[PDB]
Amino acid sequence: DVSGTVCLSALPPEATDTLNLIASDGPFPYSQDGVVFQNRESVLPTQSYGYYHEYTVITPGARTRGTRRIICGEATQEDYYTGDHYATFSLIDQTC
Amino acid sequence: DVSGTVCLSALPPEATDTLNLIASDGPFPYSQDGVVFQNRESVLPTQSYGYYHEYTVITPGARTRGTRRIICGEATQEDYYTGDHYATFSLIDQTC
Ligand SMILES: Nc1nc2c(ncn2[C@@H]2O[C@H](CO)[C@@H](O)[C@H]2OP(=O)(O)O)c(=O)[nH]1
Numbered sequence: 470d471v472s473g474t475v476c477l478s479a480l481p482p483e484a485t486d487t488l489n490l491i492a493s494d495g496p497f498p499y500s501q502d503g504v505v506f507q508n509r510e511s512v513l514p515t516q517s518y519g520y521y522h523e524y525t526v527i528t529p530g531a532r533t534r535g536t537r538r539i540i541c542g543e544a545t546q547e548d549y550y551t552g553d554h555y556a557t558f559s560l561i562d563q564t565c
Numbered sequence: 566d567v568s569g570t571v572c573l574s575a576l577p578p579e580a581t582d583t584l585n586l587i588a589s590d591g592p593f594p595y596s597q598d599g600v601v602f603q604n605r606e607s608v609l610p611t612q613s614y615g616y617y618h619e620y621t622v623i624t625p626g627a628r629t630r631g632t633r634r635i636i637c638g639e640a641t642q643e644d645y646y647t648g649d650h651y652a653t654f655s656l657i658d659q660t661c
Pocket residue numbers: 501505506507508509510523534538554555
């Protein structure tokens with residue numbers, strides 16, 4: 470299940486960076502940006518393979534790509550944030 | 566993010582000295598000159614480890630290395646100046 474919505478202004482600023490890149494179709498910092506998200510744990514609504522894609526949300530100070538990601542779906546503004554490597558997701562509200 | 570581009574002539578003259586030393590591969594005044602800059606805070610574009618290196622920009626009168634540095638990237642003419650110990654950066658334009 471999606472854990473409610475979260476205002477974009479409340480997320481780490483890098484979340485805004487990633488959305489901006491998704492809007493311009495990159496260029497993305499990591500070669501893994503834009504790969505299909507399989508939704509293998511079925512936390513998000515079931516859809517055909519390829520419906521969701523994932524993008525890194527950089528964690529300043531981390532030595533790796535870390536655990537923050539934005540997952541997009543095909544619907545308009547259908548963007549989910551996860552800060553715990555897909556354990557939980559929130560739908561991003563870009564209006565607050 | 567990079568703050569903007571600044572002409573080399575608009576930076577302290579010591580920035581010029583540092584760039585001249587980098588062009589001749591030293592010798593450098595400090596042993597830390599030329600070590601890898603990790604980009605740990607993710608201020609500059611994401612790159613592999615070792616893409617960036619740091620060099621001191623001498624602060625006249627200082628007893629320590631101070632807060633001025635030139636960070637080079639592996640690309641042609643990619644050099645950034647920081648006067649606040651990596652809080653902010655400007656790309657240096659050596660053509661003006
Ligand atoms: N847990 C999980 N990882 C997924 C899923 N789809 C793609 N992945 C990616 O597959 C990897 C293998 O576990 C994960 O680290 C994640 O890589 P990312 O680090 O790029 O997010 C999914 O549905 N669940």
